Every structure is written in structure tokens, then in C-alpha cells.
Amino acid sequence: NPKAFPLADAALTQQILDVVQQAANLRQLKKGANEATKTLNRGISEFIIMAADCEPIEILLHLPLLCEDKNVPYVFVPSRVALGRACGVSRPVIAASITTNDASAIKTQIYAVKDKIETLL
């Protein structure tokens, strides 16, 4: 067991990154570590994606404890660069969060990814 433990393999990683890109287009993604912990303590979050290769790792390992407290799925993508590119911004991000919405046109996709990463976790 490493610190960044529940890492996803390549198929789950690309499923995660595709729904991250679609939520970023639909304004349902809060990107960055402290925005992610803000939306996590506010409770509007469906799952959090941490990238398992940033330059420290505890910098985002603070978030699994918060997700565990509030029972939110969390998953580790192995590329901060690809995560930022999926988020649609011109920088690497290390953590992102899918906020809850019921007037959301990708709710089935988000729920399927939640089920996959929760059976992983």
C-alpha cells in the first residue's frame, strides 16, 4: 500500500477523464485542491479525483481523510498533466471535484463512474 493507494488503471482513467472533461464543459467541475476541499466540506461533491504524481503527495493526501469523513468516493489518476488537460485549463491540476447537480445532462455517466470507482474503493 502506497499513500496514493486507490489508483485507477488505464481504462478507468480514461473513463474518469472523459467525464471530467464533460463536467468541465457543463460547469459541474470545481478544479484545484483548495476549491476541492471547499466543495467537499460544503457537501456539494459527487467524487474527487486526485493525481498521484504531483511534486509532494501529502499536498493532496489531505483530501482522502475529508472524503472518508463525509463518505465521498475518491480516486487517483496517474497524470496531473492529463488531468489538467481534461479539466480544460492551461495548467496541470492535482485535484478536482464533480459537484452535485440534478439539472445535469451527464448524471448517468457520473453515476456510472461513481459506481466503478466505489467498487474499486
Interacting residues with another protein (CB under 8 A): 2-4, 7, 9-11, 14, 17-18, 21, 26-27, 43-44, 52-53, 55-58, 78-79, 81-82, 84-86, 89-92, 103-105, 108-109, 112
Phi (first) and psi of residue 82, to 5 degrees: -65, -30
Write down the least CB distance from residue 63 to another protein, Å.
16
Write down the least CB distance from residue 34 to another protein, Å.
18
CB atoms within 10 A of CB 5: 12
Q: What is the largest CA-CA distance in the chain?
A: 39
Task: Pick the closer one to another protein by CB: 34 or 70.
Answer: 70
Task: Pick the closer one to another protein by CB: 27 or 121.
Answer: 27
Strands 47-51 and 29-31: unpaired
Write down the least CB distance from residue 39 to another protein, Å.
12
- The CA distance from 8 to 83, in Å, is 13
Write down the least CB distance from residue 8 to another protein, Å.
10
Task: Pick the closer one to another protein by CB: 34 or 111.
Answer: 111
- Please, is 110 exposed, middle or buried when counting C-beta atoms within 10 Å of its C-beta (0-12, 13-18, 19+)? buried
Phi (first) and psi of residue 7, to 5 degrees: -75, 150
Task: Pick the closer one to another protein by CB: 97 or 104.
Answer: 104
Coil vs helix vs strand at 70: helix
